[PDB]
Design goal:
The structure is cut from a larger assembly and holds two copies of chain A, one copy of chain B (108 residues), three copies of chain C (173 residues) and one copy of chain D (123 residues). Chain B has 108 residues and is an all-beta fold. Helix content of chain B is 0%, strand content 38%. Chain C is 57% helix and 6% strand. Chain C is built from five helices and four strands. The radius of gyration of chain C is 28 Å and the shape is rod-shaped. Classes of the chains: A mainly beta (51), B mainly beta (108), C mainly alpha (173), D mainly beta (123). Bound molecules: a molecule of 3 linked components (NAG-NAG-BMA) (3 copies) and 2-acetamido-2-deoxy-beta-D-glucopyranose (5 copies). Chains C, F, G: This is Hemagglutinin HA2 chain.
Chain lengths: 51, 108, 173, 123, 109, 173, 173
């Protein structure tokens, strides 16, 4: 027993991210299925501490 | 100016053991700090610049660790060569430079 | 060489400074330290974050059903349902992925351009009272204390006040 | 390898002037700085002066501020230590140290150290 | 007397992918893809969903002698089955319009 | 402050000029007023319009049907019809919106860059015969009549003709 | 005029050089001809190609079925199948097209910017020992042999070595 935004045959997901790659079957208001493995954007600069 | 000090001063340890002596620091001086060797007879050399990395052609038995005010030095193993006088330097604020008072290690 | 891939005018960057994204390292008598350009970071954090917020918030949501069940005499429905579901799956992968690769260059180019224009600002503020030592580091011919140094961080600087001091520099050379 | 040479030590009475020549070789002197350190007998090192490239940035320790002068020559890749008004507590060795770089940031740690030379005083 | 230009850069193992290059390390990053699941179903729309124990919708609706543990579970949000529901309908036959019944009974108050 | 976010080198702009998008404010003895750079505006209106035209004209159109009707015994079809219709509805909201949000910055940056490069053109045309008065305004040390001034608007300018005049300025200073 | 629309600072380009995309035309005594900037060409081919590789490689593929058949009494299926198939067809036309139209300007601007920054690099390497002859062509006041000229192609250049030679130039003028 808990609270879940949507379900999934394996379980449930959290947060309000716009994509997920855990299962193409869902129950509720939660995002589309994506075959990709990982994808992120950046906010800061390239991390180059020293040469 | 930025005042720095080391303590205790005199310590004798059996070779091959572990002996660490930390030098305090006013303000924070971030991670910017240098530690110098001085064997009896010749000029000082450099060991650790930035408190994280060794210099060129330096035995790796030393260890540069610490952040902010709490700055420490530790040596994995001690040989008869390591018995020298140690200086720790800060260079975050660099109109002046201030060294420590030196800590001497000896045996027999 | 990755550093050669960008071929930027600035080196890898610093780590001691913590209170900003773009800043300066003012050196002078009795005054060394780091600094941060509070005008640039706040006006650069917001736009980049809003790009992330725009991507996240525009994923509108509605209740959705799972692929239903069909008996063995109605296989046409099952494959039609697979075709539509796979069509959306293939669409979103390409659409989502190509967005975060095309817009990752946009934010990375934004950061590179932010350094350049800020670097140009100090150049134009004072021109003859400085020497191009190297990679984005000037050298003041005159003497300039902390109150003077803040003029560079401000938008204020009195050239004629220090131009006559540059005449003394002409004497040295 | 990088080698430095120093000269000009000896005995100088109070009120005189001394010039210590510090030659540089094995590295690009034009793009690198230099500095000086002083060690009294028995005590720790006390930095005195550091000068960046092209003789445009000069700094002096408060102890001797306003009475020391430093200059550099690129053609002869040597550094001088001009000074006057000798003290009685100034009997100390004077080493040569190489600044990291001019255009870099984090600056202050010294890599190469020369032997130095001894300067004393007498009544 | 120098002033220099630089940008903040702290220790970080975060990696991002772009078009000019790949596997580049950056300071701060935010993801969009979630790949973590709790591993347990939960009460979703404020109402506990019913759990079928070794039973199917047809078997339970028709009132099999088994599946008697799920009579006081009226309101729900969805129905959870077993991958191979065995105790379905006892007397064999062909349940007309089976699929439509499941969809209609998928949600009730 | 919105003006602080952009941090542009030019002020809010003028309203007197009407015959262009980028222009000048030539002033001289026996001459004043506004102008317009017919070269830049014509090459700026076309590309921006074609970007709008490209967005509008590429919406291919074809006859479409409404969501059909189904009886109570074929509910499965109705939800499948809803799933496919809602899938396209969700796609177009995100696709269309992120297009006009990402391509609005492209045009805003384009307009900002147009001012800069046009500014850069007049700086390089004459270098020592001008003073950086401030925000994109120069001051001619020499006298320059309207015929001379049009040289700035042209791509033509004779430096040696006026370099000797700048020697008189050297005498002034 | 197409060249007027772009208004680039460089002319149409050359055809003699073949071993690169950006280069130089060092001319001097006992020397002449073209050259190539191996630092930039390999650094520009990769990113542009990876943009094409990213577009092509992201087209994930899977087994697909054709539009099935239906008898005259199940026409609702046929139109539903047409609606979903036509929906994807309309999506991919606009999605694919606007990608190669928006990203064709990105690569075109990239090439234009690559010329400028490389052009800017030679200017900063030596400033007073050069005259702005015209469209991206400088003139060395001093004499510069082939060994000297490679300094421009390198990142290395000893200004004070030739600054005293520029004093001889001051004598000529
Ligand atoms: C750059 O910007 C800063 C802040 O935006 C300015 O700081 C302010 O500068 C004024 C005058 O330069 C200071 O006023 C002074 O206060 C002292 C107090 O004893 C007084 O004795 C002086 O006669 C004068 O009135 C003001 O305190 C200072 N603000 C602070 C310290 O928070 C600065 O002036 C701008 N310009 C430059 C060149 O830095
Ligand atoms: C800048 O561009 C403008 C137009 O593109 C040029 O204007 C034209 O300039 C020429 C000579 O500068 C004018 O010819 C002159 O005509 C008068 C007529 O009395 C004659 O007396 C002169 O001897 C000379 O032949 C021409 O009329 C003028 N075009 C017009 C007014 O429509 C201009 O020359 C370019 N250069 C500069 C520095 O402005
Ligand atoms: C620019 O970069 C090029 C290549 O990256 C440098 O070329 C190399 O330059 C050095 C010295 O300038 C050459 O060494 C010389 O070799 C001759 C052989 O007879 C010797 O007599 C000289 O005393 C000196 O040791 C080296 O050969 C040359 N590399 C080649 C030809 O492949 C160049 O030095 C850099 N700088 C400039 C200003 O071009
Ligand atoms: C889900 O996220 C919320 C915060 O958004 C958090 O409070 C909650 O503990 C999370 N649930 C689990 C199971 O981690
Ligand atoms: C940097 O290293 C320290 C030392 O372990 C660590 O505490 C810190 O979290 C690291 N930085 C970040 C951003 O995690
Ligand atoms: C990225 O580079 C690091 C460092 O070489 C390596 O450990 C890691 O496996 C690389 N990851 C990918 C996805 O290439
Ligand atoms: C349900 O089925 C599982 C697997 O066949 C079995 O282990 C379990 O005992 C069954 N429970 C009941 C109540 O029939
Ligand atoms: C229920 O299923 C079990 C196997 O899981 C079977 O042995 C038993 O006979 C079934 N009984 C009924 C009433 O369905």
């Amino acid at each position: 027993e808990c609270d879940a935004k949507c379900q999934t045959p394996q379980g449930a997901i959290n947060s309000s991210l716009p994509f997920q790659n855990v299962h193409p079957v869902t129950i509720g208001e939660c995002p589309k299925y994506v075959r990709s493995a990982k994808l992120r954007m950046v906010t800061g600069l390239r991390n180059i501490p020293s040469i | 100016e930025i005042v720095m000090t080391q303590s205790p001063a005199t310590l004798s340890v059996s070779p091959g053991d572990r002996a660490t002596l930390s030098c305090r620091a006013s303000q924070s001086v971030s991670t910017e700090l240098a530690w110098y060797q001085q064997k009896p007879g010749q000029a000082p050399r450099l060991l650790i610049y930035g408190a994280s990395t060794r210099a060129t052609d330096i035995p790796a038995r030393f260890s540069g660790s610490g952040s902010g005010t709490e700055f420490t030095l530790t040596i994995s193993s001690l040989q008869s060569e390591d018995f020298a006088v140690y200086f720790c330097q800060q260079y975050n604020n660099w109109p002046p430079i201030t060294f420590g008072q030196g800590t001497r290690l000896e045996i027999k | 060489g990755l550093f050669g891939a960008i071929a930027g005018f600035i080196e890898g960057g610093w780590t001691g400074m913590v209170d900003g994204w773009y800043g300066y390292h003012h050196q002078n008598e009795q005054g060394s330290g780091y600094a941060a350009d509070q005008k640039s970071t706040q006006n650069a954090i917001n736009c980049i974050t809003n790009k992330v917020n725009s991507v996240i918030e525009k994923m509108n949501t509605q209740f959705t059903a799972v692929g239903k069940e069909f008996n063995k005499l109605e296989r046409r429905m099952e494959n039609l349902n697979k075709k539509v579901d796979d069509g959306f799956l293939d669409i979103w992968t390409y659409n989502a992925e190509l967005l975060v690769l095309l817009e990752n260059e946009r934010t990375l180019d934004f950061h590179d351009s932010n350094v350049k224009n800020l670097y140009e600002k100090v150049k134009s503020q004072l021109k003859n009272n400085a020497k191009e030592i190297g990679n984005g580091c000037f050298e003041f011919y005159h003497k300039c204390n902390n109150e003077c140094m803040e003029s560079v961080k401000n938008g204020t600087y009195d050239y004629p006040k220090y131009s006559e001091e540059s005449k003394l520099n002409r004497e040295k050379i | 390898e990088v080698q430095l040479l120093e000269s000009g030590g000896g005995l100088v009475r109070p009120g005189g002037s001394l010039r210590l020549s510090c030659k540089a070789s094995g590295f690009s002197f034009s793009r690198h700085g230099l500095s000086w350190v002083r060690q009294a007998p028995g005590k720790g090192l006390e930095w005195v002066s550091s000068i960046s490239g092209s003789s445009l940035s000069r700094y002096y320790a408060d102890s001797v501020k306003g009475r020391f002068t430093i200059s550099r020559d690129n053609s002869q890749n040597t550094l001088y230590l001009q000074m006057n008004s000798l003290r009685v507590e100034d009997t100390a060795v004077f080493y040569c140290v190489k600044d990291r770089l001019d255009t870099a940031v984090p600056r202050g740690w010294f890599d190469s150290w020369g032997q130095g030379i001894l300067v004393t005083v007498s009544s | 007397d120098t002033i220099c230009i630089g940008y903040h850069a702290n220790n970080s193992t975060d990696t991002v992918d772009t078009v000019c290059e790949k596997n580049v390390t950056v300071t701060h990053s935010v993801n969009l893809l979630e790949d973590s699941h709790n591993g347990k179903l939960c009460l979703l729309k404020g109402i506990a969903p019913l759990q079928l124990g070794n039973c199917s919708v047809a078997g339970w609706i028709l009132g099999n002698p088994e599946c008697e543990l799920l009579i006081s579970k009226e309101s729900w949000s969805y129905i959870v089955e077993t991958p191979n529901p065995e105790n379905g309908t006892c007397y064999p036959g062909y349940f007309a319009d089976y699929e439509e019944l499941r969809e209609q009974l998928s949600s009730v108050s």
